[model samples]
Target chain A: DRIIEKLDHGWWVVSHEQKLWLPKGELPYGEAANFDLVGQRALQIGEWQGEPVWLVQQQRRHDMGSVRQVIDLDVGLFQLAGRGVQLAEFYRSHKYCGYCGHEMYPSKTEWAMLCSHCRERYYPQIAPCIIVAIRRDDSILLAQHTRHRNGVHTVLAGFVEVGETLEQAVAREVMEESGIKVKNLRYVTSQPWPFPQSLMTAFMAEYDSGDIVIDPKELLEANWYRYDDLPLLPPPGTVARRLIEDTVAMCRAEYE
Target chain B: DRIIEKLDHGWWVVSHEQKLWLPKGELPYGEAANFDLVGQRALQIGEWQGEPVWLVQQQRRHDMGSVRQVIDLDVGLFQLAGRGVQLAEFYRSHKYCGYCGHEMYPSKTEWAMLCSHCRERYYPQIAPCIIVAIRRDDSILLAQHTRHRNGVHTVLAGFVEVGETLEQAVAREVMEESGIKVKNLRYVTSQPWPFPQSLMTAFMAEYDSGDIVIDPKELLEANWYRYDDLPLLPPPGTVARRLIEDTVAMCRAEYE
Candidate 1:
């Protein structure tokens, strides 16, 4: 009924006679038949040396709803480590060639699906996308998408077009969203943002020269705010937040 | 009819009266009808004394074909510029979009086709391919594809697969054709091969360790020949030839 200890890897040690192993190295799979409740999922647990252990979500504090309901969970480093395991599991299940609907198996020496019928090789998809932080002197530019009522604005971001470079897409997306000319673009960092699988390559670009022209259909408003007088920002543990924070710190250091 | 004078760019020259001009920049007009010939279908002329001048299809004379039959009197650069231009002209001439049947027109400021109703913009195609020079101790490798066996053995090359990196594509194509394990691979150069609109990224790789196991489907014959004792190679006007020449010179220097 109680969590005995929290493991370093962020899994909860729970009290039960039978141990639970997650399905395909994800999503705990075990019996919760003994515990019953109204519209509630039971947290199964196990015991070692007769000590009771309570199962808990790695991120135990649920400010939102269920663990699955959290749209984009930043489980810190744990989420990063889980990406590889999740990709392998996903490819194993969907290895069939999509073009011909044939059974596929992994290649002998590479991470790819080898189709037995069509001779097609399918690989895990990590779609490349660009997220840019637009800066103008001591100010950083951001946009508020129409879907987001939260006034907090972030830099222009979107999926890379089929045949465009990471740099070209950044320029195009920035122009489309804010109509600002960005120059002196430089790559900063990258992270696996697997909402359904995406590789976000973050960049920092100086606001070259253009007025704010928001596409009302795409964004509610977009404006540049001085680093010292910025509005609400992205929550912690996100690439967007880190980039914006870094830009602000850089600007402050320059001014001081 | 002859080189009336030499220009700063090159020796080729044509008379002002012979120059073809279309109002829309390089768009094909006048006698320059669009066709998809792979090579030597047209000529390129630099401006000389405010006049267009160059020998059209002079390179084709290097071929075994007759000069009169191969010469294109129109001598426009649009078709030879690339498949991207070819695609743009072909798709833009269509009254409507093939996908949605919406009216389309040329986009301003860039070479793209924009649909009026659906608002889709189509840009030029850029197909990434690999051209590799496979090397052994004192010899370089070359192979003749069945399609290109006009007695020419050029560098081993192939188009990159959908999900492979440029380096991986180079290694894969080389191994598939020559069965050699290349090591110490380094990127050499890149060129926009406008024949059918491809971006050929060239690479140089040394034979780490592997026997000659040729893939019959891909290559007619694979051989490792010493630079000093070589057979006839490809003509001197391509990125592939440059890569081979560099590899041969490096290999020959070591022996000498």
Candidate 2:
């Protein structure tokens, strides 16, 4: 097997296992100096700033970080880096066919890994999750996830399970995580979040019933607060931030 | 690995490699007879007809049929059977860890396959797809897929890519498959479909521009037709059929 490349002047997401090689320190994505890259083949995932963005499987470099570190930069570039890392992860995890245990290779025409024996096909996996912002009379539902070290209070979210619709998932997650029932669920938008690859479908809903009873395993705490008196919230350029902000504005509309 | 059972007399989805047993045939869902089924290991997936719905892995039986054949019965049952088959497929395909080629075992607490060596966990995979009904001035755009042997003409749909949003996928798929542009892309509803496995996020859009030049790879033919003059469509149970009906009603409203 050889390294595949669409080798060109581009932004490189050189990945080793789960970590990405971020050549620059903080704001980590920009134009590359076009050299030694051909030796390490790459796949051009998308274009950013008028140049192709490349995904390459390379050795762990001194300048490396988890894909989330790119969030400090432009949000668009963050998504780009997320895409590349997800692609790399997909490739890394699918070198062999899961069913047949046969060695797999890339498809010529599409983004797929093809098995030599059973001829099974594999593609990049993107798990779909539901995130909802529930609004009460003059407040929005916010929670501090157990994983939140940034003290960012965000809305309730959970992964959609097999045999359930997005709406069903949202309701179940809300009830299970916070002991709340919601109604008037409306689709807002979606984001390709690469916290190890999840496509988040966003929704806003009105509180139908119940009080906040946090699932301690998932959340440190959860509550409904007035729009003006909220705690530290998720930063800009995230779907959760946008949802919280949107719910807050709606809450203010009633007061005015 | 021992089979986990929440066993009770119930609806049983007995699965083989890619097929499901249909003991009753054609509307093949009912109170599965209280039989010697405890001898055969089973895992309860859901409930129906006041009994637990068991997903049992059994040897290929003469009563076995493709999961799609359940579509002839209740649509809900079709989805139920689809869900069961998808679960079975997930379990079958993930017997070996793709990363390390190690035999994986089921997690006791959840629906996850755990790779003991690497500690990597995998759950049932659901690919999100976009299906849209595009209307152009009192007419709805419908296409005959190459796979449609029943002569049913349905709306455009395609799998969402790794890096794009649902709306972006809808736009790209429509352009790629039918050479059309659309606007006012409002989400309708979602369905868990298991022709293989896909979570379909549906939408209704107004045609913006371009002609009906079909991509022979995906569609046999595509065109805009007045509501009453439409051809045979997907059955009443499917979301595609509902989208066409909803779009047709809108077309009729203008004349009324």
Candidate 3:
């Protein structure tokens, strides 16, 4: 009576590259429960609806899609898988210590990787980014990023540079990319977008002044459009789309 | 000669360890201009009062006070040195790539460390943390952290864990450190605290419920204190202190 043999299983958010394994259209916790997943390391990232959510790497190559598609699936499970993907990437990227170049191992007490040599601790990197929707009376400023290929028009957003706050980041990003100024920044909401680790802090701002001179590298085109007459917006459930909706709502309250 | 050697210098925020070198009780850009700090690796961190602020290490270990003391020194120069300290720490800790155990060099086009073998790029780690001041009637919740040695009761604060938003972080930290539930969270401001790289996002919240039960590991003592009669507080220039003062101002307006 000294042995333990029962399998310890939970909501397995299996990831490979940046995509998660949707076994039979659900997580591994569903149909793939019978299959043994002992070879790869497992980490408990968080709890999803009272069920312990475990993070693991995909054991073998299988059907995988961009994590962005998971957003359309369901927001809750989508974010759960996002968190696991981030943790998986964190483990892969921090296999060794940056300081001493020593092999690192996961810490039992916390979500940190400890170096075998220097003993430095590394945590999952969650880069804070700012995404703001600017308003000028009834119009909202939207930009088509070079990556969007002149299709989807989203609000201005970028990673916060060193030595700047979210406010400064919001202002600097708006100014740098759109060549315009914004003011009266209001914190709307934030989303943990872990398409490899990013915390999008969203805000809604009013257009203080300046003309839109788009940076050729960041944006193909950017201009102000009436809240009602908007361009092709970002997909729903994304913070960018949420911020855009918020600005439009504010405009709807006033002008519509 | 086709090139010039006038020594491109502006505001030099020199540092050693977690402290700064205050030559003549000022930055090296002031009095130590003739000393020539050309040997050390220098990088431009930011601009201060229209001066191109450069970051360099202290040539020889001499007198250096903690960056905390710089808050009392001058808020402007204080933050500039903080940026320098964070960048210096970033470059130091990332001398080797964590992924491949290879030597890492600073990227020429960006503020990132590039691995020699893998060519993976690493940006400066800007860990986003939440610091909130909770108010209940005329009193505000304050906690004496274990690090503060049972003195200097400040508001609840902690690092943002993986897969949590800043709002969620504010809620979790308040609950974990003080055993209290907070609501109606108002975003105040954010500060770039770079003792070893942190972005402190400040918020003010109204105490929803729960009694003060301090986490023994994190806090020595924690309780609500009236705005008029408060414990030894943090320095004025700090975001915590600012939040406290703001909450106090709110209390003063209503009850006083």
Candidate achieving the largest TM-score: 2
Candidate 3 regions with alpha-carbon error over 4 angstroms = A1-16, A19-65, A146-152, A230-236, B1-65, B143-146, B149-153, B229-232
Clash pairs (backbone) in predicted model 2:
none
Per-residue lDDT tens digits for candidate 1, residues B1-256, read 1222222232222111113222222332222222122232233333333534333332111122211111233323322323323332333233344335446665555556676776544454445667898888788887777766668788888876533456777788877888778887776655554333455657888988788887887778888888877777876766678988999888877887
Regions of candidate 2 where Cα sits further than 4 Å from its true position:
A1-17, A21-64, A228-232, B1-17, B21-47, B50-65, B228-232
RMSD of each: 15.0, 4.5, 5.1
What CAPRI class is candidate 3? medium
Residue pairs that clash (backbone atoms under 3 angstroms), model 3? none
Docking class of 1: incorrect
TM-scores, all models, native as reference: 0.43, 0.83, 0.80
In candidate 3, what are the lDDT values of residues A172-230, reduced to their tens digit? 99999988898999998777776768788889999999998999998989989999998
**Which of candidates 2 and 3 reaches a greater DockQ?**
3
Name the regions of candidate 1 deviating beyond 4 angstroms.
A1-256, B1-85, B88-99
DockQ-derived CAPRI band for the predicted complex in model 2:
medium
| Interface RMS for model 2 | 1.7
- In angstroms, how far off is A64's CA in candidate 3? 5.1
Ranking by TM-score: 2, 3, 1
TM-score of the A-chain for all models: 0.63, 0.82, 0.77
Who is ahead in TM-score, 1 or 3? Answer: 3
Q: Which clashing pairs does model 1 show?
A: A2-A54, A14-A53, A14-A54, A15-A53, A16-A46, B13-B54, B14-B53, B14-B54
